[PDB]
C-alpha cells in the first residue's frame, strides 16, 4: 500500500495516492476526520486572509472543517456551496462548474454574501474552475471576492490563487 | 417566519421546514456558524464518556459539530457519506430504513478495536444512528454513546440530547 508524505505547518501525513488521470497520480489530501492536520492547514492560510475579509466561502465536503476552523480563528462566518440539491434547499443559486459539477448555494447563505468582502477557500486548487464558479456565485449574491486561497496547488492553476504548498503529480 | 432555538446561551432565529404534512420544525444548521457550533459542541462535551476514543458522524451539517468536539477532546473522528464518492476505497455500505451510508475503508480501519461515540446534530427516529452503529460493528469497533444536540419527538433508540425541537 503506497503512501506519499505531504507536510503543512509542521504536521506530516503519509497519504495514499489516487489516479484521476491514467499514469498521473496525486497524493490524497483529506482534512475530514483529522483535527491536527486541519489546524495546521487553517493556521497556514490564516496569514493570507486579507484584513478586510468579512466572510469565507467554500464547497463541500472535505474543505468544510478547514474553512470552519479558519473562520472561527478569524472570527468570521462562512457559507458552503453543495455539489447537489439537498432536501428543503431554499431558492438556491445554481452554478455550473465549467467542464460536469454543479454547485448549489442555499438562499439563506446567499443573503449573507450581500455587500460582503468574500474569501474563497479550498483544500486544493488545480485548474481553478471550481473557484471561478464560486466567485460567480458570490457576484450573483451581491458581494465580491477579495481573496482566493487553497492549501495545496496542483500543477499551474488557470486562476490567481494564494497557496502554501504544492501537490506533486507522480 | 422564523423560530428561536437556543443552545448554551447562543440563540438562533431559524427558518421552518415541513418534514411532514402540516408539521413544521425549526431548521437547525451548524454549517457556516462557528459560534453556534461551538456552543453546541461544548454542550455535548459533558455527555461524552471518558473512555471514548473516536467520534463517528455522517455528512454534512454534523461535520463541523463533530470536528470541533473531536479537536476539543483531542480525538480523531470519521465521517460516513450519503453517496459513493469518486476514488472511494472498498467502503462499508449500510442502508437506513428511512438513504444509504458509505464509509471509506481508510476510515473503517480507524474504528478497529476502538470505543466509538456516534454524533449528530438532530436525532428523530434514530435509524440513521442504528445504521451507523452497524457500520461500527462491521469495522470492528464498539459504540459507547450516541449523542445529538436536538431531539425530535421520541427516538426508537437511546440517544442523549441537549434540547428538544418542538413540532409546530
Ligand atoms: Cl469533497
Ligand atoms: Cl445535510
Buried-exposed string B9-26: b where 16+ CB fall within 10 A, e elsewhere: ebebebeeeeeeeeeebb
**CA B61 to centroid of ligand 2, rounded, Å:** 5
Contact check, Cβ <8 Å, B71/A35: yes
* C-alpha A119, offset from chain centre: 10
Beta bridge partners, A167, equal: A154
Q: What is the DSSP letter of A134?
A: H
Taking CB atoms within 8 Å and a gap of at least 24, the contacts of A90-93 are A90/B15, A93/A137, A93/A140, A93/A141
Question: Which-ligand-closest: CA of A30?
Answer: 1
Task: Kindly list the residues from chain A whose CB atom is less than 8 angstroms away from the CB atom of residue B75.
Answer: 35
Count of domains observed in chain B: 1
What residues have CB less than 8 Å from B24, skipping those under 6 apart?
B16, B17, B18, B167, B168
Q: Say if CB A104 and CB A85 are below 8 A apart.
A: yes
Q: Is the previous residue joined to A61 through a cis bond, with omega within 30 degrees of 0?
A: yes
**Method used to obtain the model:** X-ray
* Helix (H) / strand (E) containing A131: helix A129-141
Task: Tell me which residue of B120, B118, B88 sits closest to B106, measured CA to CA.
Answer: B88
Q: What is the 3-state secondary structure (H, E, C) of chain B?
A: CCEEEEECCEEEEECEEEEECCEEEECCCCCCCHHHHHHHHHHHHHHCCCCCCEEEEECCCHHHHHHHHHHHHCCCEEEEECCCCCCCCCCEEEECCCCEEEECHHHHHHHCCCEEEEEEEEECCCHHHHHHHHHHHHCCCEEEEEEEEEECCCCCCCCEEEEECCCC
Strands A78-81 and A55-59: parallel
What residues have CB less than 8 Å from B127, skipping those under 6 apart?
B96, B97, B98, B156, B157
Task: Tell me which residue of B39, B3, B92, B29 sits closest to A87, measured CA to CA.
Answer: B29
Question: Which-ligand-closest: CA of B59?
Answer: 2
- Rounded to whole angstroms, how far apart are CA atoms A110 and A85? 15
Question: Which-ligand-closest: CA of A124?
Answer: 1
Q: What is the DSSP letter of A127?
A: S
Dihedral angle computed from the Cα positions of residues A107, A111, A114 and A116, in that order, rounded to the nearest 10 degrees: -110
Interface test with A, best of B15, B20, B65, B67 (most A CBs within 10 A): B67
Strands A11-21 and A93-96: unpaired
Task: Kindly list the residues from chain A whose CB atom is less than 8 angstroms away from the CB atom of residue B60.
Answer: 60-61, 64, 80, 82, 86
CATH number, residue A147? 3.40.50.2020
Does the annotation flag B53 for ligand binding? yes
Look at the block and give the residue holding cell 450516541: B146
Look at the block and give the residue holding cell 432555538: B5
Q: What is the 3-state secondary structure (H, E, C) of A18-79?
A: EEEECCEEEECCCCCCCHHHHHHHHHHHHHHCCCCCCEEEEECCCHHHHHHHHHHHHCCCEE
Q: Say if CB B130 and CB B124 are below 8 A apart.
A: no
Q: Is the previous residue joined to B87 through a cis bond, with omega within 30 degrees of 0?
A: no
Determine the 3-state secondary structure of A151 from DSSP: strand
Which cell goes with A116?
460582503
Instruction: Please tell me the distance in Å from B86's CA to the nearest CA on chain A.
Output: 9
Q: Say if CB B34 and CB A68 are below 8 A apart.
A: yes
- Rounded to whole angstroms, how far apart are CA atoms A120 and B21? 38
- Rounded to whole angstroms, how far apart are CA atoms B20 and B126? 17
Task: Tell me which residue of B108, B116, B141, B136 sits closest to B48, measured CA to CA.
Answer: B116
For A111, the domain range is 1-170
Strands A144-154 and A162-167: parallel
- Rounded to whole angstroms, how far apart are CA atoms A93 and A106? 7
Instruction: Please tell me the distance in Å from B15's CA to the nearest CA on chain A.
Output: 9
Chain A, nearest residue to B79 by Cα: A33
Task: Tell me which residue of A128, A65, A135 sits closest to B68, measured CA to CA.
Answer: A65
Amino acid at each position: 500500500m503506497e503512501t506519499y508524505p505531504i507536510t503543512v505547518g509542521g504536521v506530516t501525513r503519509h497519504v495514499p495516492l489516487i489516479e484521476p488521470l491514467p499514469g498521473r497520480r496525486i497524493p490524497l489530501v483529506e482534512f475530514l476526520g483529522d483535527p491536527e492536520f486541519t489546524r495546521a492547514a487553517a493556521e497556514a492560510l490564516r496569514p493570507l486572509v486579507p484584513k478586510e475579509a468579512e466572510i469565507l466561502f467554500t464547497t463541500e465536503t472535505s474543505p468544510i472543517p478547514l474553512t470552519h476552523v479558519l473562520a472561527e480563528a478569524l472570527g468570521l462566518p462562512y457559507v458552503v456551496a453543495r455539489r447537489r440539491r439537498r432536501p428543503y434547499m431554499e431558492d438556491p443559486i445554481i452554478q455550473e462548474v465549467q467542464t460536469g459539477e454543479v454547485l448549489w448555494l442555499d438562499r439563506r447563505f446567499a443573503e449573507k454574501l450581500l455587500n460582503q468582502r468574500v474569501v474563497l477557500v479550498s483544500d486544493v486548487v488545480a485548474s481553478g474552475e471550481t473557484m471561478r464558479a464560486m466567485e460567480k456565485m458570490v457576484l450573483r449574491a451581491g458581494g465580491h471576492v477579495v481573496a482566493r486561497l487553497a492549501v495545496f496547488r496542483q500543477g499551474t492553476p488557470g486562476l490567481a490563487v494564494d497557496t502554501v504548498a504544492e501537490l506533486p503529480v507522480l
